[PDB]
Amino acid sequence: LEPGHAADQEQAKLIRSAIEHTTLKSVTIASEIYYDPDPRSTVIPEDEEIIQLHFSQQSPWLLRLELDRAAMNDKDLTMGQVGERIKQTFKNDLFVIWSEDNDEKLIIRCRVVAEEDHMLKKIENTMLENITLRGVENIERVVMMK
Amino acid sequence: DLDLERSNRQVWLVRLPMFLAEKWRLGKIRINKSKITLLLNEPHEYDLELTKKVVENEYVFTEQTIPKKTAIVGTVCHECQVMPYHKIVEQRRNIVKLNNKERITTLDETVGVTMSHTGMSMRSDNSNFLKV
Amino acid sequence: LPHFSKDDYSPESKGFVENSYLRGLTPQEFFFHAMGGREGLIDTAVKTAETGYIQR
Amino acid sequence: DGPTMREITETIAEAKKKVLDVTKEAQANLLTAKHGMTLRESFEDNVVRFLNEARD
Amino acid sequence: TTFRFCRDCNNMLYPREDKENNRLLFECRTCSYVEEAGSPLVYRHELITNIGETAGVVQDIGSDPTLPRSDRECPKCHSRENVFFQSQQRRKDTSMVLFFVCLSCSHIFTSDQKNK
Amino acid sequence: DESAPITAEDSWAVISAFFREKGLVSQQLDSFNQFVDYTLQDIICEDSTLILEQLAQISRKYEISFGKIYVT
Amino acid sequence: FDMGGYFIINGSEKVLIAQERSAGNIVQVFKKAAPSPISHVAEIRSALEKGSRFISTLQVKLYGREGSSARTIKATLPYIKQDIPIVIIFRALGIIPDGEILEHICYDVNDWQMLEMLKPCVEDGFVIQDRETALDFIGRRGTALGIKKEKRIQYAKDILQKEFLPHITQLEGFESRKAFFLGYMINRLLLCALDRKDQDDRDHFGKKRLDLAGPLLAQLFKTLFKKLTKDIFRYMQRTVEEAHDFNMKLAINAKTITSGLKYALATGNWGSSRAGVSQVLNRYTYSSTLSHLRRTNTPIAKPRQLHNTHWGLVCPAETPEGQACGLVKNLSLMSCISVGTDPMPIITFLSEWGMEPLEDYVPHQSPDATRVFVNGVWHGVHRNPARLMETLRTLRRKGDINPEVSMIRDIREKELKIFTDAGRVYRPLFIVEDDESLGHKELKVRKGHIAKLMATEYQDDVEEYTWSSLLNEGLVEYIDAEEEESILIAMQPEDLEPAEVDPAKRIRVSHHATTFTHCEIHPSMILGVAASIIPFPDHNQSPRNTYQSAMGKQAMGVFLTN
Amino acid sequence: FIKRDRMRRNFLRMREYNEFPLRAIPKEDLENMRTHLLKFQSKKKINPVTDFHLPVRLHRKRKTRQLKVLDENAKKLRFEEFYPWVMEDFYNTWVGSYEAGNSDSYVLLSVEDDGSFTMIPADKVYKFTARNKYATLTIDEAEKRMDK
Ligand SMILES: [Zn+2]
Ligand SMILES: [Zn+2]
Fold first, then answer.
1. Which of G69, G71, G116 to mutate to test the interface with A (most CBs of A within 10 A)?
2. Are G173 and H98 within 8 A, CB to CB?
3. CATH, domain A22-135, list 3.40.640.10, 3.30.390.50, 3.40.1010.10, 3.30.1360.140
4. Which of A54, A60, A53, A57 is nearest to A34 (CA)?
5. Where is this region: Bridging helix (chain C)?
6. E74 marked as binding residue
7. I need a surface site. Which of G11, G47, G177, G326 has the fewest CB within 10 A?
């Protein structure tokens, strides 16, 4: 590190959070696909809260996934900046919603403009593997040493 | 000209033990109303288990591209299995585990006789084989 | 070894030799010590076999 | 000497109590491993460290 | 995920979108057998797998001499005679949390004091 | 008594009763003896039959088969 | 004092060193850490028990790395070039529906993961849905010498009835059985892919088979006998074709067998395939001959390192140094090699107690049925392995079944392997019984049997009480390295069996374990011949025991009296 | 602490019901007809032959001096009869195959009008499979369609 910012742990945590590779699959507990034809209304009774907030022609098929809050902590992340990353990845073809940090259950939902399931499953592979949330390539397990 | 005779006949399939089956290659069944046995002729009595109660899609036919004479017998009604002085049968089952083969026999002669029969022994022909 | 229980993480069963060469060793310790000896011999042999090629 | 043999027996015994305590805390899932290793690696490092410390 | 099979065909029922009534259906592409949908769920990946740790539990698990014995009592029947073993899921990040198997009611109660 | 547990030294006797029966090199003798006893008859009997097919114009055949082998 | 156990060729004492090879007819799975598209390989070397010596090996490959989707399964077949999916083979075996295929592969409907990974194979199996189109598919894929299709469909069916899985049998109609076994191999491959089972270890000594003079002379005499028959028939065809007289002296030659056996037992080669089998007997001393005849060789995980399965079977100290270190092994003092028996009476005896055949098996009607395996062949299941196992063990201890047969009952795997093949290395151990009149566990052998035994020993009035009398009464049992996985052995009898100190004695373990099934005769028997001469090897480091075990094969002494 | 080698001197100094009879049908009917078994593979529970409709039909569909290999009897007789039979109408199709292994011991207890039974030894056993339910195929069309 630099001689000016020496003997500092928080700065080294920022540098580690700036170079250590992170991916979307790292934070992902599980994902699941739903058939929900109406774009706005959702059959799922829980996510209705999200439906109430994050809203205020598209695919009938829903892609949904859940993240580990502990992963959101150990690897510092924001549901917002994640949704930003995906939105600036696929651009406008895939509509995106993500749950709040306040939610005790982290939820992310996405849709598109044969069966829609296969298309979604392709997008699943792209999401898990081909998205890097932060950090430069080929860097892992940065260890602090005095 | 295949013709179904009846198929209404009900047949029971039985998985017998080997000595009685090879013996069959007559008794009296006693149906006890859910436990049934068999009183053979002098000799043992045998409880036959209701192996499979429902036994559909199984039938029995007989035979008297090459079409042949085909006749249909009856439907299979119940899958069964005969279950078994039992100490003698257990001893016979232990006794079947004693099969062996004969070992190689060592010729004990004076060798010179056999070794004389090996090579040239001034004895030819004596057997017609590939003699043209 | 088939002389201990399953899922045993005790140090004695995992290779710790608490006895000394003055009072002898137990079989389950002499076996592991034999493994370490054979491993030492093999390691020395490989280190020499590669040391020669490096030397050339 | 005798007292030295008893001091060695107690030295090893204290390390055995430490490995048993870390073993119970590991079986109770009450020990979180540090960054870079897993629970089993840190546990083996602690046990091996205690055994080598008692032997030294 | 827990899909059904066709009748007579016994083939897997691929999901078919119903655009007329706008509702999910299950079809067989070999035949014309299409049944309704009792759930919108179709696919679940479940990345982080935690099942399989307690695999291979049999009714005759109490007669295993190789397995150890403990004296901790069961929370249900309060029987101190039980047999414990760790998780059956073999993986690097698998915790060493013990699994207690009572020899009376056959209940599987663990020893984790953090999460139960 | 006769139903008393054995000791550690007593086990040595058992080992004696082992080496009196087997011997230090009994595996080669047992394997070789079993080879001579059964393996010869098995190899001879597993592929002894060979036939020659002779044609004439009436068909004809010849056969040679090996039976019980004899060792000296 | 001449121990014998060797041959004499041209006045030279030749010794046939015990060869070591791997076993067959066992499903194995391995991982591939290479960038190859195959992630796991399910190898199984299939071969008959006697005759022909089959080398064909079936392989079930799993394509697609972890993380990526569309992970199909494709298994190779002999004489067929490209690989064929498993479901298409299931169509070629007579099973058309896919629910029955998933019913044969996965035996648990509650598990969704294996069935989930089966989906792509059910898709390609949807592409080809007919049995006749599958037989024509395998007929068109491999072996193009049939030319005609009508002969390549029946020829492919004959391949599936004969060359496909040489073990079990080779008759027509056994396609259901082989379908269940194939679904079992797929269940082991996918079950290994779900990280529920570790990679199959090849260093386990129980999965290894040794070869003495028996198997070697079986291969040699087999090939020489085949050549003899072929030559005799050649003389027959020459005789009938050239139209002459026949003679028994010109048809059957003796220099083929004499030159074959004399040449193979004379030279190091066993026909380069195999070399170094026959070595001159080392007569430097008596322990050099004892340790020389018991010497076992291993042809070229790390095989040189000492494995934990070598306890009581291979000497942990007696090993040479140099290039052949750890590849040469020595038999421990009470270790023997099996000779092989007959599995037919056992298979015949199992079906008399309700052992359901394999072709009648339904996993939905009997999910808790225990599978029975005889030499790797799956003959059927049984819904009561407790009483059956107790019966086979009681009849195994009485002397009916040959004690060389090793039977294992894997509880978690829910299997019961039976090994009666030649080549396994076993060792005798005592039998421990828990039900006694004292209230605790105690050995089966008592003091009266020891008194009669020593009476016969020192008497040689006699009582004819020897080792065989100790074995037939159920007091001592042989255990290989496979059964050793399912037993608990005790070291000292009077130190670990009863239930509860001078500082000069060594510290030992405790007796918290109660389910001791067997007990070690004596630990000092784990050493070989050369290490047995060492005085107090416990108080000495291991490499010195190895160096002394190496110097004990060249010291001056008196080998014999003649 | 020493090896006790004087054990020779120590050992030398120390030493309501219903009964119904069974009968065997005369062997003439066994010489006239051979009894085989039927087992279906369509999962459907019912499937009787009355619901199979009519007309039910079950029918089976120069060199010098050289060398021959050999072969035995029963296996040859079973090898020459490599034509499986089929039952159809004029449509449902059922094609059976041999079972072989389920020979062993199988005795039939045919129930007549009276309470007694007639026992007949089973010759063989066959597994019938309902064929051509969907009605489709292709051969070369599937070989070219599988190359995508
Ligand atoms: Zn269908
Ligand atoms: Zn309980």
1. G69
2. yes
3. 3.30.1360.140
4. A60
5. 27-39
6. yes
7. G11
